[PDB]
Amino acid sequence: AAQTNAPWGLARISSTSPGTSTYYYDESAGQGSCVYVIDTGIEASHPEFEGRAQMVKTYYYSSRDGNGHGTHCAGTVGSRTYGVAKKTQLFGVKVLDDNGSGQYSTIIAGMDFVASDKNNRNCPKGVVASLSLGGGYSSSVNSAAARLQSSGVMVAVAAGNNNADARNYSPASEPSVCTVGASDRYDRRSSFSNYGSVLDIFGPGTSILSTWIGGSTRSISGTSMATPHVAGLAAYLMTLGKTTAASACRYIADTANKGDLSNIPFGTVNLLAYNNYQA
């Protein structure tokens, strides 16, 4: 399958080279996989989700995404037009309020919720969690992300937007999950992207067009936008039987575009998520 005039990030993850416009992907498109988007919620009614999105948990008064950030991330995972894994099942877990903030205790509860909730969903190709969030180092937040990964979920987390070593941020600094840096359309490290030894992978994170609330779209930038590329790519590869939740991050790193990125500090991986699609 070939989506012409795709958002640059989708094109990028199906190319060895920057500056292409076509997203090439296997038609299976993550069908049979589940991705939990642990965020501000998902506007499941957005036509771009084609009925494949549903809120499964909220830690606030409403499950509605009053912010947009969760809906954007969900759109990069699995919307029709903006998504890596266009046939994945999206499940919204609202751990962030409508300002995009959330207490650590709530984010941890939302991770533990996914680890349990996945057991009562039909996700035959496996389960992914996309955590486009983060704050300062917290051993308890990292432990929660480690548990969710251990439970058999491919956890992808944002490296953070501090232009600093991700070692000081959580859950970015949890070694066992897939910590995702951001790149731009020219294969530079996104100016804001965290870096460091704990990064597993980069994905497109600068000027990412996806779904927004009110049935809209917009382009925003962040390691929050890179993370769902990787989460969707994991869902896609798991559906293709190429990898499993336990190994997807390593598989994505192993199969990444290597050495393509500029402004990668020594000791940070130079790896850009790539689906290796061959028609």
DSSP state of 165: B
User: How many residues are given for the chain?
Assistant: 279
| Interacting residues with Ca ion between 17 and 56 (CB under 5 A) | 55
Region of 43-51, 62-70, 149-157, 210-218 interacting with Ca ion (CB under 5 A): 62-70
- 134 lies in the binding site for Ca ion (CB under 5 A): yes
Region of 72-80, 126-134, 229-237, 262-270 interacting with Ca ion (CB under 5 A): 126-134
Could you confirm whether 193 is annotated as catalytic? no
Q: Is 177 annotated as a binding residue?
A: yes
Could you confirm whether 46 is annotated as catalytic? no
In angstroms, the Cα distances linking 106 to 60, 109, 142, 190, 217 are 10, 5, 13, 29, 28
One-letter amino acid at 220 equals: I
Q: Which of 26, 48, 98, 184 binds Ca ion (CB under 5 A)?
A: 98
- Stated as kind and residue range, the H or E segment containing 236 is helix 223-239
The beta strand positions in 40-146, using DSSP E, are: 53-58, 89-94, 126-131, 135-136
Candidates 14, 33, 39, 229; catalytic one: 39
Token readout for 252 is 């994505």
70 and 41 in contact (C-beta within 8 Å)? yes
Candidates 79, 130, 193, 224; catalytic one: 224
Token readout for 225 is 């936008």
Residue placing its CB nearer to Ca ion in the complex, 32 or 117: 117
235 and 35 in contact (C-beta within 8 Å)? yes
Region of 27-35, 73-81, 83-91, 199-207 interacting with Ca ion (CB under 5 A): 199-207
Q: Which residues are annotated as a binding site for Ca(2+)?
A: 16, 175, 177, 200, 260
Q: Which residues bind Ca ion (CB under 5 A)?
A: 16, 55, 58, 60, 63, 97-98, 134, 158, 160, 200, 224, 257, 260
Active-site residues: which are they?
39, 69, 224
